[PDB]
């Protein structure tokens, strides 16, 4: 999705301001919002790919004006409605429609074990690897309206496969209920000149991006 979230190479965002000695949570409300994520993922209310894509689909201005955890807040209020876990009324009113009908999957007893384990996107088998480290590849020019992990600034660009990480879930399909379609993910190296052109580049700098097998073609 060619949205505001795909920021790589954009101009005009200004200096990188950094708050000295920044706390993990700047406001109490952020603690609530952050802790809701693992809780709702554990229920299987949605997966992380639909979550990313929900943030991608918020209005561009809302995205820019909202602090990070407002993005998450937006997902919970909207993605849960789209998934039919909540109704628009429940979310507007703040009041459940029929009391405690669900049971929390994330309970105190499993919090530690679940955070310590996580959920890898690696898979045993999937499409064979078409590329080997050292291969020159060109990122396909694709502009899906849905979730994708090929950044806009890499499309049509030629780089070099420098790592084959093995097989992983494909978010482009997983975000849209089209299955996992596991395939290889490579780290591809692009030169500064290749991405940005002669003028806007430095001769030494390179950019490495992780791309799925079918995002690529032989250069």
């Amino acid at each position: 999705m060619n949205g505001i979230h795909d920021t790589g190479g954009a101009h005009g965002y200004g200096p990188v301001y950094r708050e000295p000695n920044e706390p993990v949570f700047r406001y109490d409300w952020e603690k609530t919002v952050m802790s809701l994520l693992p809780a709702l993922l554990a229920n299987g209310n949605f997966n992380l790919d639909e979550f990313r894509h929900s943030i991608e689909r918020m209005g561009p201005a809302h995205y820019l004006e909202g602090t990070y955890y407002e993005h998450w807040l937006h997902v919970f209020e909207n993605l849960l409605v789209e998934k039919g876990v909540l109704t628009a009324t429940e979310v507007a009113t703040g009041k459940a429609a029929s009391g405690k009908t669900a049971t929390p999957v994330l309970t105190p007893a499993i919090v530690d074990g679940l955070l310590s384990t996580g959920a890898s996107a690696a898979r045993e088998e999937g499409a064979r690897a078409r590329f080997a480290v050292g291969d020159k590849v060109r990122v396909l020019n694709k502009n899906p309206v849905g979730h994708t992990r090929m950044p806009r600034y890499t499309r049509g660009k030629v780089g070099t496969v420098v790592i084959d990480h093995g097989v992983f879930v494909t978010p482009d399909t997983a975000a849209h209920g089209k299955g996992e379609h596991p395939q290889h993910v490579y780290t591809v190296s692009f030169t500064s000149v290749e991405l940005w052109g002669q003028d806007a580049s430095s001769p030494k700098d390179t950019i490495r991006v992780d791309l799925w097998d079918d995002f690529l073609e032989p250069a």
């Binding site: 979230h5 795909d6 920021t7 790589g8 190479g9 965002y13 200004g14 990188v16 301001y17 950094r18 708050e19 993990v24 949570f25 406001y27 409300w29 609530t32 952050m34 809701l36 809780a39 209310n45 820019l64 602090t67 990070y68 807040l73 919970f76 429940e90 979310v91 405690k100 009908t101 049971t103 929390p104 994330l106 105190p108 919090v111 955070l115 310590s116 384990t117 996580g118 959920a119 890898s120 996107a121 690696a122 992990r149 950044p151 600034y153 990480h165 879930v169 780290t187 190296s189 500064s192 940005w196 806007a200 430095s202 030494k204 700098d205 390179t206 950019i207 490495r208 992780d210 791309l211």
Partner: protein
């Protein structure tokens, strides 16, 4: 000149209320357990943070066999120190050398190695850093008071997939036979993202 889109702009005046309303709704429907959520907050507020990565760096500095294992299998390597899990399932450690300076970013959102660095600071997740890091690394680094020699390659790693990256910074000169413990004090969060160097003694 207010903060507008750099991660530190003020939230809406009523955000705490909205959050509280959603939380009550989810508890009432039985979708979330408040006690479990408290344990999640505690984990990232007090138990998971850059000190974890610092131990990993320090150990790689003093132990060549560990360093090799770490560079071969990041996830297993950091697990030797008890670090593992959410947003760190598939780790790749990036070794800085005199020829190469590594740094990472998630241009598409905020992806970051939680088990070793904890949750990302707001600037890492915001447009200025994300947009510029892949086009003008040197310019961004200069704003952090870091000037990379012109002859040193900068490698920017964009976290677009499920791999998570951590930088293994170079050991500062003049730190011979330091204990892992004293070495770890030198390792800043910045040095492990690549936006800084470890402290010089």
């Amino acid at each position: 000149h207010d903060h507008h889109h750099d991660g530190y702009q003020a939230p809406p005046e009523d955000i705490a209320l909205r959050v509280k309303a959603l939380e009550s709704l989810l508890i009432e429907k039985g979708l979330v357990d408040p006690a479990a959520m408290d344990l999640v907050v505690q984990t990232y507020e007090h138990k998971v943070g850059p000190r974890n990565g610092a131990k990993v760096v320090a150990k790689a500095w003093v132990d060549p066999a560990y360093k090799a294992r770490l560079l071969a299998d990041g996830t297993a390597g950091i697990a030797e120190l008890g670090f593992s899990g959410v947003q760190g399932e598939d780790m790749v450690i990036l070794e800085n050398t005199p020829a190469v300076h590594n740094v990472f970013v998630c241009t598409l959102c905020s992806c970051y190695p939680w088990p070793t660095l904890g949750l990302p600071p707001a600037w890492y997740k915001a447009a200025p850093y994300r947009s510029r890091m892949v086009s003008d690394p040197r310019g961004v680094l200069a704003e952090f008071g870091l000037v990379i020699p012109a002859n040193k390659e900068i490698r920017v790693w964009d976290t677009t997939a499920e791999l998570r990256y951590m930088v293994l910074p170079e050991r500062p000169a003049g730190t011979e036979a330091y204990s892992e413990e004293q070495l770890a004090e030198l390792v800043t969060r910045d040095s492990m993202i690549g936006t800084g160097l470890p402290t010089q003694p």
